[PDB]
Design a protein around this ligand. Structure first.
Ligand SMILES: O/N=C/c1cc[n+](C[n+]2ccc(/C=N/O)cc2)cc1
Ligand SMILES: O/N=C/c1cc[n+](C[n+]2ccc(/C=N/O)cc2)cc1
Lengths: 540, 540
C-alpha cells in the first residue's frame, strides 16, 4: 500500500485510491461519512455529526446518491442522463469526497469546495462531470465535494414545527463545511483558505451561505456559476412551503381519513412512507404549469435566513470578501423543452407568435396579464414580430434573464458596491461534443466540464484547443482560490480581467479567443426585471 | 442428450430448452425468427418471411422486445414494471415462442396462440406473466406467442402511400399465424385446431383477425379478454392517422426546413431517425388530454379492414365460429391514475364533484358538452351526488364501460345473433398479491396471471385456493381450445357455463366461488353507449 492513501481524521481512519491523469496521479478519498444517516425518525431533521468509527473505512468509491427524481424525458440521451444518478439511491447518502495532489502537499494548500446544482431536487457529487482529478493535478489544490439532501428529504418544510423545520439540505452542506475546517489539514489543505464554488442551485446555495452568519465563518471566497440566492426559483415563502408539504402528504395518503392534522401527525405519517413514494409525487405540488420552478427549495423562515435573500443582500456588509460570478451564453434554452409549447430538442423549435405568447406565461408563472404584456413588449422585435427564429431566441432570453442573468447581475452589483471585490464572466464556448441541438447554443450547466478539466480525459473526443481552453479556465479558478484574483499573480502578457463594479459593470468573455472586456450584463433587460417589473406588480 | 429439445422447421433446425414446473417438465422453443428484421428501409413496411438458415438456431431464451415507450410513472413499482420490457429494445424483434408438453404429443394437439396487449404501443411475449409453462403442463396443449411491432413502428400510417401503409403490426401477427400453420405440427400441434386468445389490444387484435378474410382462415376459435376491435381506442381514421404521422415527423425534424413534404420524402426522413427518437415523441401527437387513448393504432383504410370494425361486425356471418369473451370487474380504475384529476395510487382518490366533472371530459374525449352532460346524468347517484367514494367508482365505470365493457357486449351480442357460439364471463377475483391499491378492485389486465397458471410458481406467495382457482381457469380455456366449449365434456357434476345469447345475455362470474350465472353485461349502461349516445352526437 502507498502510504499516502492512508489518512486519519477525527472520526477514524480511511483508505483512499490513486486516480490517473495524463499529467500524473492524484490521491482521492471518496465516500467519507460526515453525518449520521438521516433515516427513519431522522428524516426531515437537521444532520447530526458522524460518530467516530473503528477500523479503516474504505474510501475508494463514491457512496450512494440521495433519493431524487430521475429524468426520463429522453431515455438514452447523453444530454440528460449525464445529470442522472450514477449510483444507487438511498437516504444513507451524507458522504463527502476529497481529492488531494500526489505527492501530498507539505505546506497548507487552498481548498476548493464544490456544491452541485440540480434545482434543489436532484444532483450528486459522483457525476462524471464533477471529477476533480484534473483540477487537482493541474493546479495542485485540494478539492472537496459533498452530497446533500435534495427534494422533500432536504427542503420539505412545515415552518414553525420542529419535526420538519426546512432547509436541512443547506445544513447538510454546512456540516460538510465544518468537517472541512476540522479535517482538511490531514489531507494537506489550508482551512484558512476555503473557496466555495457551485453551479445553478449550488451557486444559489453558495449565496445562501454568504448570507447566513453561522456559515460565513466557514469559508473565505465564493464562486457563483449561473445561479444566485435571490432568483425567483431559489426560495419560497412559509405559506407556500406549508401548502406544498401538505399537498405532498395528501398525495401519499397523509393523514389517513379522518385523523388530522397538526404538523406532528403529518410528519409522522410522512416518515412511514417509502422514500420512492415521496419522490413519485414531488412534481405534482407545483402551483401551475411552469419551467425553471421546483417543488422543495430553501424556505425563508427566519432561522437559516433571517430575512429574504434580497433584503439580506441589500443590507449586507461584504468588506474583505472576493466573489467570482458568471453565466453561460444561453441560460434559458435548456428549460424550454420542459414545458414551453412548440419546443422539441429533435427539431429546430421554430415557434409561432401564438406559441411565444403562451410560452411567456410558462416562463414567467403567476404574473398579471399586464406584467406579461410588459415582458412581450421588451422581448419582441417589432420589426420582425412573427419571425420564428427570433421568437425562439426571445423566449430563451426571457427565461434566462428572469431566472439567472438578472438575479446574478443584481447580486454582483450590490456585492461590489457594498465592500466585496467582484469578478464577472460570460461563458461563450459551445463544447464540440455537445449532444443538445445547435439552436440551444451554450446551454445552462455546460461550462462545468471545462472548469473541471474534463477535456483532458483521454477517453473523450475534445479538440486540442478545448484542452488548452480548459487549462486556462482551471488556472483562473485556482488563482481566485489562492489569491482572490483570477489574473496571473505576475504574468503581464495575458490580457487582464478587471473587477466588476456597479458603475463600469465590466466582465470578460470566456471562449477559445483571448479575454475580451465587455460592459453590462444585459443592463437594459435587467433594468426591466430588477427595477420596473417589481413596481408593475405593486400597483396590480 | 434430450432429443426432444431438437426440432426442424421449414426454415432450419432449432434447439429448445426444458422448463421445470411442480407437475413436470415442458419443452420450450423461445426466440424463433419468423420474419426478416424490419430494419433500415424495411421500417414501417409489411413483414416478409424469414429466409431459411443453416446450422442450429439457439431457441433457449427470449429475443429482443420491439421498440416501445417504457412506463416510468412509478419507478420500482411492481404494478407497472411487470408490463415493462424485460429484454433489450430493438427493431430486430419479430420472433415467436412455442411451448410443448413433455413428452412431445404423438397425436396432433390443439394450439393456443397468445397475442399480448398494451394499447398497441407496448408489450412483449417475454413478460413473466405470459409464461406458458404451467398452461402447457397442466392441460397438455401447444402454446404459441409472438412479438409484433407496436407504436409508430407497427402502426404509423400515411394512408394510400406505399412507404407507410399502416397496420404492419397486425401483419406481423398474421405472418406468425401462417408460421403456425406451416410448422406447429413439428412440435406436436394440430394446425386444424388453432385458438387465438389475447387481452386488451391483443383482444382487439384477435377481433380484427376475425374481420379480415386473409386472417380468418388461419384459426378456428377466438378468446377476447377485456378488449374488442370496435372500441373507441382500437382504431383510427385515415385523416387522423395522417395528422398524427405528420405531427410525429415534425417533432423529429421531418421534413427539413425548405424541402417538400409528400409521403415518400416524409417516410424517408423518418427512416433515418434513431428508433428511440421516435419513441420519445409518441405521446405528444395525441389530440387532447385523455386516458385510454393511444397514438398509433390500427387504421381503417380499406386494406386490412375493408370497413370500420362496427360495420364488419354488423354485416358479418359467423356460423361455425366459437368465441369466448369477458371482462374484469373494474376495467376503468387502472387508467384513472394516468390523467384523471384528483387520482393517485398512493391515496384513496376520494375525488370531489368538480374533479368528477372534469374527469368525464378526460375519460370521454371529444364529445359535445351536451354528450358529457348525458354521461354525468347516467353515472351520478342523484341521492348522493357529492359522495367522493361513489364518484370515484362512477368515473371508473365511465372509463371501463365506454372503452371495454360495452364494446365487448356489443360484439358478443352481434356475434351470437349472427351464427357464432359465444361464452361470456366477468372476472371478479382480486389477487392476494396485487400491488395496486384496494380501491382499484380487480383492475384491467389482472386475470392474465390466473389464465397462465402463474399461482403455480413455487417462488410466488399465492394462496392454496388461488392455485386451485388457476387450475379451474386453465381447464376452462383449454376445454374451449379443444372442443369450443369451456364446460367439461365428461361432466354434469360441476356448474354449467351457458352460452351467451343476444336475448338472455347469460354470463358467469369467475372467482373462488363455484360458477354463478348472471344476465346482462351492464345492459342499462351499455344501452346508453351503444344506442342513445350515437344518436345524441348525430344531432350534435
Ligand atoms: O410522472 N411525472 C412526470 C413528470 C412530472 C413533472 N416533470 C417536470 N420536470 C420539469 C423540469 C425538469 C428539469 N428541469 O431542468 C424535470 C422535470 C417531468 C415529468
Ligand atoms: O413528461 N411526460 C410524461 C408522460 C408522457 C406521456 N404519458 C402518456 N401515457 C399514457 C398512458 C399510459 C398508460 N396507460 O394505461 C402511459 C403513459 C405519461 C407521462
Amino acid at each position: 500500500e502507498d502510504a499516502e492513501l492512508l489518512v486519519t481524521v477525527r472520526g477514524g481512519r480511511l483508505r483512499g485510491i490513486r486516480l490517473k491523469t495524463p499529467g500524473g496521479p492524484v490521491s482521492a478519498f471518496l465516500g467519507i461519512p460526515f453525518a449520521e444517516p438521516p433515516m427513519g425518525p431522522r428524516r426531515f431533521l437537521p444532520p447530526e455529526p458522524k460518530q467516530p468509527w473503528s477500523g479503516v473505512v474504505d474510501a475508494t468509491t463514491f457512496q450512494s446518491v440521495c433519493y431524487q427524481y430521475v429524468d426520463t424525458l429522453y431515455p438514452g440521451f447523453e444530454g440528460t442522463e449525464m445529470w442522472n444518478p450514477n449510483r444507487e439511491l438511498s437516504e444513507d447518502c451524507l458522504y463527502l469526497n476529497v481529492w488531494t495532489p500526489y505527492p501530498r502537499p507539505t505546506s497548507p494548500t487552498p481548498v476548493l469546495v464544490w456544491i452541485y446544482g440540480g434545482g434543489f431536487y436532484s444532483g450528486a457529487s459522483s457525476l462524471d462531470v464533477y471529477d476533480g482529478r484534473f483540477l487537482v493535478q493541474a493546479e495542485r489544490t485540494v478539492l472537496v465535494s459533498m452530497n446533500y439532501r435534495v427534494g422533500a428529504f432536504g427542503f420539505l418544510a412545515l415552518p414553525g414545527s420542529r419535526e420538519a423545520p426546512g432547509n436541512v439540505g443547506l445544513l447538510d452542506q454546512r456540516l460538510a463545511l465544518q468537517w472541512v475546517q476540522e479535517n482538511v489539514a490531514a489531507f494537506g489543505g489550508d482551512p484558512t483558505s476555503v473557496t466555495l464554488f457551485g453551479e445553478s442551485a449550488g451557486a444559489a446555495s453558495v449565496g445562501m451561505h454568504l448570507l447566513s452568519p453561522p456559515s460565513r465563518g466557514l469559508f473565505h471566497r465564493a464562486v457563483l456559476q449561473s445561479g444566485a440566492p435571490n432568483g425567483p426559483w431559489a426560495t419560497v415563502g412559509m405559506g407556500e412551503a406549508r401548502r406544498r408539504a401538505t399537498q405532498l402528504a395528501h398525495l401519499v395518503g397523509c393523514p389517513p381519513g379522518g385523523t388530522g392534522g397538526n404538523d406532528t401527525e403529518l410528519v409522522a405519517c410522512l416518515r412511514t412512507r417509502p422514500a420512492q413514494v415521496l419522490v413519485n409525487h414531488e412534481w405534482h405540488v407545483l402551483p401551475q404549469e411552469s419551467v425553471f420552478r421546483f417543488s422543495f427549495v430553501p424556505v425563508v423562515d427566519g432561522d437559516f435566513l433571517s430575512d429574504t435573500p434580497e433584503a439580506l443582500i441589500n443590507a449586507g456588509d461584504f468588506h474583505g470578501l472576493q466573489v467570482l460570478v458568471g453565466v453561460v451564453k444561453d441560460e434559458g434554452s435548456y428549460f424550454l423543452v420542459y414545458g414551453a409549447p412548440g419546443f422539441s430538442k429533435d427539431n429546430e423549435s421554430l415557434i409561432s407568435r401564438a406559441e411565444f405568447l403562451a410560452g411567456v406565461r410558462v416562463g414567467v408563472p403567476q404574473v398579471s396579464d399586464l406584467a406579461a404584456e410588459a415582458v412581450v413588449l421588451h422581448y419582441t422585435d417589432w420589426l420582425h414580430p412573427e419571425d420564428p427564429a427570433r421568437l425562439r431566441e426571445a423566449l430563451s432570453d426571457v427565461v434566462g434573464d428572469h431566472n439567472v442573468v438578472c438575479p446574478v447581475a443584481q447580486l454582483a452589483g450590490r456585492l461590489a458596491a457594498q465592500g466585496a471585490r467582484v469578478y464577472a464572466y460570460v461563458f461563450e464556448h459551445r463544447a464540440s461534443t455537445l449532444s443538445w441541438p445547435l439552436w440551444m447554443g451554450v446551454p445552462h450547466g455546460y461550462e462545468i466540464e471545462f472548469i473541471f478539466g474534463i477535456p483532458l480525459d483521454p477517453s473523450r473526443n475534445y479538440t486540442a484547443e478545448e484542452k488548452i481552453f480548459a487549462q486556462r479556465l482551471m488556472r483562473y479558478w485556482a488563482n481566485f482560490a489562492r489569491t482572490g484574483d483570477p489574473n496571473e499573480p505576475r504574468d503581464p502578457k495575458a490580457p487582464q480581467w478587471p473587477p466588476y463594479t456597479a458603475g463600469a459593470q465590466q466582465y470578460v468573455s470566456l471562449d477559445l479567443r483571448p479575454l475580451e472586456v465587455r460592459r453590462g450584463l444585459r443592463a437594459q433587460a435587467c433594468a426591466f426585471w430588477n427595477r420596473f417589473l417589481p413596481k408593475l406588480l405593486s400597483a396590480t
